[PDB]
Structure 1
């Protein structure tokens, strides 16, 4: 309960500054593609007790979090959790994390802008996309 000598005040893992003063499954939420419902089963399958702060863990279990986190399908995070369950281009089952969800997002946006389907034209013009009224709401 006293700070260890192995206590970390920051982590910078996957190039986002994870603060060492917060709890672990709420420290990892800055990576886009893990939220909390992914996080608590990540620390369920990585076999770590949840109670510790971000600095209290050693580097070996932390790298077990990241290495099991990148391919969760090896370690029985099951198939309905997945972020892209059928890709347009690959067709593999994947859970896409911080910098790859962004690239797949703007490629799907620009693919919609290329082929003259509706939703990317609604995305480009400045409208709500999913059928909303913008007569009264959403004014900037």
Structure 2
């Protein structure tokens, strides 16, 4: 951005237990953590006051600690309720938004919930089969 590189520019920064390529732009490297994506990483850069032009390795430690609590607790920052991943959360009831290690954790807890009871959508994951209304005659091929 016609500005010189800083002395502290990490090529890989680590946020939410995830390696993040600091050579990228700031939202598009902030989508590398699970649960974020492009449409939400522009809201983390907007609520943190981070310019979207800057590269992700120039984010200092006080800027990365502000990002990680926008992602862990987004409803305190008026990111709206419809924007979140886990909104009505059966067996909890509360709206959440799942971070890096938590997306894959509660995904396994949802596939175990539907397999404890013998619900058909949990029986499809036990056999490895397709879950939605796909035909799976000519296109599985795994």
TM-score clears 0.5: yes
For the 8 Å contact 2:114–2:121, the answer to whether it is kept is yes
RMSD of aligned Cα (Å): 1.2
| Structure 1 residue corresponding to 2:32, chosen from 10, 17, 30 | 30
The list of structure 1 runs, each at least 4 consecutive aligned residues, that deviate by more than 4 angstroms after superposition, is: none
Q: Distance in 2 between matches of 1:95 and 1:16?
A: 17
| Structure 1 residue corresponding to 2:90, chosen from 88, 96, 113 | 88
Which residue of 1 is the match for residue 12 of structure 2?
Answer: 10
Q: How many residues align?
A: 140
| Structure 1 residue corresponding to 2:61, chosen from 59, 64, 78 | 59
Shift of 1:118: 0.4
Which residue of 1 is the match for residue 101 of structure 2?
Answer: 99
Give the unaligned 5+ runs of structure 2: none
TM-score scaled by length of structure 2: 0.92
For the 8 Å contact 2:18–2:100, the answer to whether it is kept is no
Give the unaligned 5+ runs of structure 1: none
